[PDB]
Design a protein around this ligand. Structure first.
Ligand SMILES: *[C@@H]1O[C@H](CO)[C@@H](O)[C@H](O)[C@H]1NC(C)=O
Ligand SMILES: NC(=O)c1cccc(Cl)c1
Ligand code: NA
Ligand code: NA
Lengths: 12, 28, 250
């Protein structure tokens, strides 16, 4: 929760 | 690379960062 | 980084954050050495005593960052890993000898005001600059003290220490593939890397050609910023033949 979510494209 | 180690916001503009002189002064 | 200061924008455009996908968290520092290659510490990727053995798909690298925690839209770039290469003689069993690894990116990263590679030293620059008393610079998003976390990238300048002093500060066996840096107790000034800074760069600005060179990788310390202790760094030049072999082959 400490880090801002990164765009989902980088997790796919 | 040929252009390695030269920072766009510093060396490439002939601007110095706030503490690089401390490094230079140690190189005696 | 203990007893450092906030980096200037674009001060360390080779700095890389190694980022765990799930849970999303900082793992280590790293550095950009070309549009496709990132250098880090082997122990950031492989450390069996802590059940650490990451695969490529576990990880991302975040390049061009300044803020630790925020997604820096239109500035940072996030890259996937094609392949990890760990030095074949990395000694995780004993003393972290040869604490070095390379990561090849799936696609080249675009350079910008915020993203630019550091130089690796040649023999002559290494011989000239790796001298006791000469200062380098360490950067990272690791903890602010041993026992908290920064808003933005931190920077500290630290002097290389005489090898006998490094050895006499610890019970660990120190090798030629390591050097140490930091102030002595009687020197007044202080500063060190700390947890989360591992894998990031120790850089020096050559007074001969005005380029920044990565002389070290943040490798290990006993605590952070303790009096009479020093930080230990992987000696990049000593391991450069391995680096070149990997890049030439792959
Ligand atoms: C780390 O993981 C790989 C498999 O992904 C494995 O083959 C390798 O032997 C492991 N290394 C150690 C030291 O356990
Ligand atoms: N825990 C670390 O990675 C660490 C702590 C202090 C100095 C150094 Cl070089 C590394
Ligand atoms: Na000793
Ligand atoms: Na110390």
């Amino acid at each position: 929760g400490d880090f801002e979510e990164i765009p989902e494209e980088y997790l796919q | 690379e040929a252009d390695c180690g030269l920072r766009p916001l510093f060396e490439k503009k002939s601007l110095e960062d706030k503490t690089e002189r401390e490094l230079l002064e140690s190189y005696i | 980084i203990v007893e450092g200061s906030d980096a200037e924008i674009g001060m360390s455009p080779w700095q890389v954050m190694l980022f765990r996908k799930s849970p999303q968290e900082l793992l280590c520092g790293a550095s950009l050495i070309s549009d496709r290659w990132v250098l880090t510490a082997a122990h950031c990727l492989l450390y069996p005593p802590w059940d650490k053995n990451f695969t490529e798909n576990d990880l991302l690298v975040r390049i061009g960052k300044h803020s630790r925690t925020r997604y820096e839209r239109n500035i940072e770039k996030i890259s996937m890993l094609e392949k990890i290469y760990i030095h074949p003689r990395y000694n995780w069993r004993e003393n972290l000898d040869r604490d070095i690894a390379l990561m090849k990116l799936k696609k080249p990263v675009a350079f910008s005001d915020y993203i630019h590679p550091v130089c690796l030293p040649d023999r002559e620059t290494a011989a000239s600059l790796l001298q006791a008393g000469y200062k380098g610079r360490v950067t990272g998003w690791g903890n602010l003290k041993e026992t908290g976390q920064p808003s933005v990238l931190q920077v500290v300048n630290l002097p290389i220490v005489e090898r006998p002093v490094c050895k006499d500060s610890t019970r660990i066996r120190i090798t030629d593939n390591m050097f140490c840096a930091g102030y002595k107790p009687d020197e007044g000034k202080r500063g060190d890397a700390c947890e989360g800074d591992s894998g990031g760069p120790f850089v020096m600005k050559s007074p001969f050609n005005n380029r920044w060179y990565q002389m070290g990788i943040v490798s290990w310390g006993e605590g952070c910023d303790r009096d009479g202790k020093y930080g230990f760094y992987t000696h990049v030049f000593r391991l450069k033949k391995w680096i070149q072999k990997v890049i030439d082959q792959f």
